[PDB]
Amino acid sequence: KRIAFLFDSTLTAFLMMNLKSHAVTMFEVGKLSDESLDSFLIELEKVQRYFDHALTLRNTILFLRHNKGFPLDLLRCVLNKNYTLLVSMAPLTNEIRPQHIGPAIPEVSSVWFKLYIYHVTGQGPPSLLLSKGTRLRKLPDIFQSYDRLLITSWGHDPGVVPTSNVLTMLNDALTHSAVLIQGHGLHGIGETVHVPFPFDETELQGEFTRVNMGVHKALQILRNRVDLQHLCGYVTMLNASSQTTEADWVPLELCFGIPLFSSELNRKVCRKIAAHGLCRKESLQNLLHSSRKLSLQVLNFVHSFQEGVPLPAKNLIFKDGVLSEWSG
C-alpha cells in the first residue's frame, strides 16, 4: 500500500509563495494521492528559503517511491486500511501537536521534552519556565550576562530577541500563554550545528571537532536512554561562546522525523534510512517495544513536576545541571 507523509500548514504556506492555484488542494483538501502526486511532479520540477524548501521535497518524493514500485500518500493533520507506514517530518510546529517513524505521543513534540533531555543529561543552557499570568518585576541575574535570548511561547515557535528590553515583552507575552526563557549567546547570535542519527560506526571514534561531534559526553548518555538507533532525525547543539573544547557545546533540542529546512542535512538523513535498514519488516518490531518505553518515562516525568499536552502549573528553573522549583 502507501506511506503517509504527515506535515502541517507551514509547508503549504512556504510553498504558496498553476502550482499556486493547485496549492489550495494541498491547503484545503490535503489528500493528495498518487494520481495527483504524479501530476504535481511536473509542477515541483519546473520550479532563499523558498528555493530551499521547494528543492527538498523533490528529492524526498523521488526517494520514497523506488524499490527498497510502492506508492505514497500525502495526508496532513480507520488508518489500518490504506496505510502501513507513517513517516512525519521534523520539526513539528507546536501549533499542531500502525508504525510511526517520529514522535509517539504529543508530549514528545513539545516544550516538556526539552526539560527531560536536560534532566537525564545534566548539560544544557539556562532555562526558566513560567506559568501563565506570572509577573516579572526584576530581571534574573543568570540572564543578565547574555546579549541574546531565546523566547518560546506555549504553542508558538521559538524566536530570538535582544536583552535590552526583554522585560516589556515578557510581561506582555505571559498574559496569554506560558513563556520559556533560554540563553542563546554571551556576545551575539549563537552557533548551531545539527548532528543526525543513527550514528555510523566510522563516526563514533576520533577527536571532537566541528565535523565529528559524536564523541560528546552529552550524546553518549542520551544513547542508552532514548534508543536513537531505530529512529531518524537530528540533534541540535548550541555554542554560546562563539565570537574547540567539549565544554562549550551543550544540547538544545531533539526532533524525530525527516528534516525539510536544509538541503545538506536532508540528503544524509535519507542515505541512512536506505543503508542501516529502518524500513525492513524485521526492523520495526523493536520500535514497537520502544514506543511504549519512552512514552511511560516522559509521561511519568511530566506528572512528577505537576503536583492536548498538559499546561505547566509550577515554575521550574534549570541551572548548574539541577532541575528544581523556582522560589522567586
Binding site: S131, R137, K138, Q144, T168, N171, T175, L311
Partner: protein
C-alpha cells in the same frame, strides 16, 4: 492570615507630570492623583503610601543631607509636598504622620526646593507663590522669615552649587540674577535682569563647571558663560530627530542625561581625547510605544552614584535603567579605585559608581589606557491598576474546614478584558490573565482556586448581543467556555449567581427565561418556560436542597427550591414599596432595597417588616458580612456607602462624597469580618476599618517578601552602631558580618533587625567588605556611599587623595 489596611494605586493624572524626586536616601517618591507613593529601586516594591492631601500633588522634593549626624540629629526620612490648593506639608515617612502645615492664598504652588546650605540650620525651605511672590519658609515650626515681591512672572529658579549667596530666576521676560541672598534679610533690589534673544523649557546650573548654566530648547541646547554672557557650546540634534524633553546634569563627571519625546534616554560625555565645547553621545536606550493616551512625564537619576535612571509614564508604569561598563572620542578607565590607586591583582568593582567607570577630565590635543564602553539595560518594571470602572470580588470566607489551604485572594475586573489577582497580605500583584475582549461585568468564585466571569459585546441596531462565559483555574490559567458555542445572536446577561455550596448556578437575561446550570458537571438542568415573570433581583439562601428567592417587575416575591433536576415552589408573598433592585439573605433576616431609598427589614420569624427610609437618592447593591452570627450589612448608594445592623436598627458609620470624602465609590465588598474594601473612581482600591476612617500606615509593622537595605528605618541607636561595626571590620582576628560574634548587650529584636538589614546587601559589596587588602579609607568611602550622606562623601575623597599624594 492577618490582613492589614492598605491602599493600591493605579494610573496617573495630568497634574502629576512633574511630581517625582530621587533623594540621597535611596528611595523614589512620585505623586498619585491625591497620594504620595514611596518605592524602592533595588527591589522594586512599594513601601509606604501617604494620603492626606485634598487636591492633586504637583511637586515632591526630598530633603537634603549635608550635615554631621549624631544622637541629636539622627538619620531620618523627611519629605515635602505641594498641592493645587496651595498647601505645603512636611512629611516624616516612618509612621504616616505630618509635622508641619504651610498654606498661603488659594493658588497652586509652582516650585519647591530645599536649601543645600545646612551649616547653621537644616530646616529652610523656599517656594514660589503666584504670581510674583517668593517666600522663605521654616520646616521646623512653619514660621515665615521674609517675603519679596517682583514685577514679573517667575517660572522656575535654581541655586548656585558653589556660592550660597547667588540665586537666579526665570521669568516670562528674561532672567533675573540675585547676588544678596541671605536667610536674615530679603533681597535689596530687583537685581540684574537680562533678555534672551519665551519658549524656554528648563533652566538649571552646571555642577561640574563653575559659573556655567544651560538653557533647554526643543531643538537646541545652549551652554552660557556668566562673566561674558555669551554662548560657548551648542548641542543640536540632527534634522530628522526627536525633540528634547528634559535634561539632568551630573556632578561626579561632566555628563548630561537627556530625555526625548519618544521616551528615549541618551548620555553625553564631554570630549577630552582626540573652538567650542563638544558633547559626544555614548549610550542610548530603546524607545517605548507612544499613544494619545500613554506618554512619558519625566525622568529622575540617582544623585549618589549617577548610574541608574527611572522613567515615569502616564499609565502608571515605572522603568528602572542601569548603566554598565565593559572593556568618537575614546574613554579610559580610572586610575584610583575607591579613592586610592590599585594594582592588577586586587578585586575591583567598576560598576559601583560612575566615577569608577570613566576617567577624569582632560584637554583635547595634548600629549598623554583601556577602552571603556557603556550600555543601558532594563532591570526593573512596576505596574499599577488599570483605568477606572473596576469590578471586584472577594474569595470565599475562611472557615475551619479549609484553614490549611486558605489564601485571601482578590479578583479585580477591568475594561481591557483582563482580571487581576491580588494577595492583600504583602500587597503584590499575584497574577494577570487576559480573558475577554470587552469590559468584564461580573466575577464570581466557584472554589478557592477557580472563578467565573462574563462579558457582553457592542449591541447592534436590533439588540442582540454576543455572550461570553469563561471558567478559569488560577494555577494553570486555562480558560474554557461554560455554555459552549451559542452563536453571536442572543440577548445580554445582567447577573449570575452561584449558590452557597458552589453547586448550582443561574443566568439572568433581559428577555429570556431563567436557566439553571451545574458547576461540577457543566451541563444544563432545566430551562424556564416562556410564561415566566421578568427577573429584576435574585439571591440564594446561605443556609442538596438549596433555596433561592427572586422578585418581578410588579413586586411579588417568589420562593423556589432546587433538588437535582426537579424544581418546585415553596410559597408566595403579597406585594409590598416600589421595585426591588437588590436582595440579601443571611440567617433568618431578609433585606430588600428599593428605588426611593428604602430598606425593608423582613424577618421570617414573626412576619414583621421594618421600613427605615435612608433619605438618600437610590440604592445600588447591599451585601452582608461573612461569618456565623455576624449580622452586619453594607449598603451602596449613588453618593456613598453605609454600614447597618440588622439586630438593632441604627446606623454605625456613613461616608458621603462631597461632605466627608472627596472621591466616589464604584464598588464595595467585605475583606474580612472586621474590614471592608472600597473602590474609588480615580483608580484606587482602599481597605478600611468598620467606620472607613483613614488610618496612618506605619512601615514598622509591614511584611515584605524581600528585605530592603535602608538604615533610616532603624532606631537611631542602631544605625550608628552598625556604622561603627562596619568601619572597624577586623574584630577579634576573623572577618564576619553578623552581630552574634561581637559583645553587644541589647535586646533581641533590634539585633534581628540589624541582621536582616545586613543580609540584604549585594554579593559584590559583601565580597569587597570581606577583603583583607581593603584599606580603612576605602571602607570609609564605601560606608559613606552606602549611607547616602554627602558631608563624609566630600570629605573622605579629598582627604584620601591628599594623604596618598603627600605620602609618596
Amino acid at each position: 492570615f492577618k490582613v492589614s489596611a492598605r491602599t493600591l494605586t493605579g494610573a496617573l493624572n495630568a497634574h502629576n507630570k512633574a511630581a517625582v524626586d530621587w533623594g540621597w536616601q535611596g528611595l523614589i517618591a512620585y505623586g498619585c492623583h491625591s497620594l504620595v507613593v514611596v518605592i524602592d529601586s533595588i527591589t522594586a516594591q512599594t513601601l509606604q503610601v501617604l494620603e492626606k492631601h485634598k487636591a492633586d500633588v504637583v511637586k515632591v522634593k526630598w530633603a537634603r543631607e549635608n550635615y554631621h549626624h549624631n544622637i541629636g540629629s539622627p538619620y531620618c526620612l523627611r519629605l515635602a509636598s505641594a498641592d493645587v490648593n496651595g498647601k505645603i506639608i512636611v512629611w516624616d515617612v516612618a509612621a504616616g504622620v505630618a509635622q508641619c502645615e504651610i498654606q498661603e492664598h488659594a493658588k497652586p504652588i509652582q516650585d519647591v526646593q530645599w536649601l543645600w546650605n545646612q551649616d547653621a540650620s537644616r530646616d529652610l525651605l523656599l517656594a514660589i507663590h503666584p504670581p510674583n511672590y517668593i517666600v522663605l519658609w521654616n520646616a521646623d515650626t512653619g514660621t515665615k522669615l521674609w517675603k519679596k515681591s517682583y514685577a514679573d512672572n517667575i517660572l522656575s529658579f535654581s541655586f548656585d552649587p558653589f556660592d550660597p549667596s547667588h540665586l537666579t530666576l526665570l521669568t516670562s521676560e528674561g532672567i533675573v540674577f540675585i547676588s544678596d541672598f541671605s536667610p536674615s534679610k530679603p533681597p535689596s533690589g530687583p537685581g540684574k535682569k537680562v533678555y534672551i534673544s519665551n519658549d524656554c523649557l528648563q533652566l538649571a546650573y552646571l555642577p561640574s563647571k563653575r559659573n556655567h548654566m544651560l538653557l533647554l530648547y526643543p531643538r537646541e541646547i545652549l551652554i552660557l558663560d556668566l562673566e561674558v554672557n555669551q554662548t560657548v557650546g551648542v548641542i543640536a540634534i540632527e534634522r530628522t530627530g526627536v525633540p528634547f524633553l528634559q535634561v539632568i546634569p551630573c556632578f561626579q563627571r561632566d555628563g548630561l542625561f537627556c530625555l526625548h519625546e519618544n521616551g528615549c534616554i541618551t548620555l553625553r560625555v564631554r570630549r577630552s581625547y582626540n573652538q567650542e565645547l563638544t558633547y559626544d553621545l555614548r549610550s542610548q536606550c530603546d524607545a517605548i510605544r507612544v499613544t494619545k493616551t500613554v506618554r512619558p512625564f519625566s525622568m529622575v537619576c540617582c544623585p549618589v552614584n549617577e548610574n541608574a535612571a527611572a522613567l515615569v509614564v502616564s499609565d502608571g508604569r515605572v522603568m528602572i535603567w542601569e548603566l554598565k561598563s565593559a572593556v568618537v572620542s575614546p574613554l579610559y578607565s580610572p586610575v584610583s579605585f575607591c579613592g586610592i590607586p590599585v594594582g592588577v591583582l586586587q578585586n575591583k568593582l567598576p560598576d559601583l559608581s560612575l566615577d569608577n567607570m570613566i576617567g577624569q577630565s582632560a584637554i583635547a590635543g595634548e600629549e598623554h589606557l583601556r577602552e571603556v564602553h557603556l550600555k543601558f539595560l532594563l532591570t526593573g518594571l512596576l505596574s499599577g491598576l488599570p483605568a477606572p470602572q473596576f469590578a471586584i470580588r472577594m474569595c470565599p470566607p475562611l472557615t475551619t474546614k479549609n484553614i490549611k489551604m486558605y489564601q485571601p485572594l482578590l479578583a479585580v475586573g477591568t475594561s481591557n478584558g483582563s482580571v487581576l489577582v491580588y494577595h492583600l497580605t504583602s500587597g503584590l500583584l499575584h497574577k494577570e490573565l487576559s480573558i475577554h475582549s470587552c469590559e468584564v461585568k461580573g466575577i464570581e468564585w466557584t472554589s478557592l482556586t477557580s472563578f467565573l466571569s462574563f462579558a457582553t459585546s457592542t449591541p447592534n441596531n436590533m439588540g442582540l448581543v454576543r455572550n461570553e462565559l469563561q471558567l478559569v483555574d488560577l494555577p494553570t490559567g486555562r480558560s474554557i467556555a461554560f455554555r459552549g458555542e451559542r452563536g453571536n445572536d442572543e440577548s445580554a446577561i445582567e447577573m449570575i449567581k452561584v449558590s452557597h455550596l458552589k453547586q448550582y448556578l443561574a443566568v439572568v437575561f433581559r428577555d429570556k427565561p431563567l436557566e439553571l446550570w451545574d458547576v461540577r458537571t457543566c451541563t444544563l438542568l432545566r430551562e424556564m418556560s416562556k410564561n415566566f415573570p421578568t427577573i429584576t433581583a435574585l439571591e440564594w439562601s446561605p443556609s442538596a436542597r438549596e433555596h433561592f428567592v427572586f422578585t418581578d417587575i410588579d413586586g411579588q416575591v417568589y420562593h423556589l427550591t432546587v433538588e437535582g433536576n426537579s424544581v418546585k415552589d415553596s410559597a408566595r408573598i403579597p406585594p409590598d414599596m416600589g421595585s426591588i433592585t437588590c436582595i440579601a439573605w443571611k440567617g433568618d433576616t431578609l433585606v430588600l432595597g428599593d428605588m426611593d431609598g428604602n430598606l425593608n427589614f423582613w424577618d421570617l420569624k414573626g412576619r414583621v417588616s421594618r421600613g427605615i427610609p435612608t433619605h438618600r437618592s437610590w440604592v445600588r447593591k447591599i451585601r452582608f458580612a461573612p461569618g456565623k452570627g455576624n449580622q452586619k450589612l453594607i449598603a451602596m448608594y449613588n453618593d456613598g456607602a453605609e454600614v447597618w445592623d440588622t439586630k438593632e436598627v441604627q446606623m454605625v458609620s456613613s461616608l458621603r462624597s462631597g461632605r466627608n470624602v472627596t472621591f466616589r465609590i464604584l464598588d464595595v465588598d467585605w475583606c474580612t469580618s472586621d474590614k471592608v474594601i472600597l473602590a474609588s473612581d480615580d483608580g484606587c482600591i482602599r481597605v478600611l476599618e468598620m467606620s472607613m476612617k483613614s488610618a496612618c500606615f506605619r512601615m514598622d509593622e509591614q511584611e515584605l517578601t524581600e528585605p530592603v537595605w535602608c538604615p533610616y528605618l532603624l532606631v537611631p541607636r542602631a544605625s550608628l552602631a552598625l556604622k561603627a561595626f562596619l568601619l572597624h571590620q577586623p574584630w577579634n582576628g576573623q572577618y564576619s558580618l553578623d552581630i552574634s560574634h561581637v559583645d553587644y548587650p541589647e535586646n533581641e529584636e533590634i539585633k534581628n533587625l540589624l541582621q536582616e538589614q545586613l543580609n540584604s546587601l549585594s554579593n559584590d559589596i559583601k565580597k569587597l567588605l570581606l577583603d583583607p587588602e581593603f584599606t580603612l579609607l576605602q571602607r570609609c568611602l564605601l560606608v559613606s556611599r552606602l549611607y547616602g550622606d554627602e558631608s563624609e562623601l566630600h570629605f573622605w575623597t579629598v582627604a584620601a587623595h591628599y594623604l596618598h599624594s603627600l605620602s609618596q
